[PDB]
Amino acid sequence: HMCDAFVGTWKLVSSENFDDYMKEVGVGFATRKVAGMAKPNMIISVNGDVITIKSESTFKNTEISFILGQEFDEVTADDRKVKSTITLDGGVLVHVQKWDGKSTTIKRKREDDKLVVECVMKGVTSTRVYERA
Numbered sequence: 742h743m744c745d746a747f748v749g750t751w752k753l754v755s756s757e758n759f760d761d762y763m764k765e766v767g768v769g770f771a772t773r774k775v776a777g778m779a780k781p782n783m784i785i786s787v788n789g790d791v792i793t794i795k796s797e798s799t800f801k802n803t804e805i806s807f808i809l810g811q812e813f814d815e816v817t818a819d820d821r822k823v824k825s826t827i828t829l830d831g832g833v834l835v836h837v838q839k840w841d842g843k844s845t846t847i848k849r850k851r852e853d854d855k856l857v858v859e860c861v862m863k864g865v866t867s868t869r870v871y872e873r874a
């Protein structure tokens with residue numbers, strides 16, 4: 742019941758500062774422009790200890806499955822090959838990605854009827870707000 746309030750199908754309804762986040766991560770111009778148009782569906786499910794997060798989008802479809810606290814390989818929507826670890830901290834899913842000596846942290850939280858995704862790279866934050874589909 743660990744992630745019950747996250748489970749479901751969610752649709753992006755607003756974004757702030759995403760272009761700058763992507764720049765900070767190292768995403769190139771064309772990818773930033775195409776990725777920034779997308780309005781993804783995020784589908785979160787749990788089966789036993791395994792959490793699955795899918796992103797269905799006109800840009801890229803992605804899928805990760807993981808156990809909390811257990812590192813895994815991830816290929817991100819912008820084609821970084823990263824090592825990821827996701828934990829639950831005070832009810833927030835905290836996702837750290839490491840690659841090439843760099844790090845970014847993605848927090849996913851339930852706030853009212855929304856699922857808020859906060860993406861941080863050094864000093865740069867982007868906030869992505871999802872609602873139930």
Ligand SMILES: O=C(O)C[C@]1(O)CCCC[C@H]1Cc1ccccc1Cl
Pocket residue numbers: 753763766768776781796800817818819847858860869
């Ligand atoms: O789409 C989102 O709302 C969230 C997201 O799918 C997971 C968290 C990180 C940002 C984003 C992935 C992502 C990362 C770099 C370049 C383009 C993209 Cl699309």
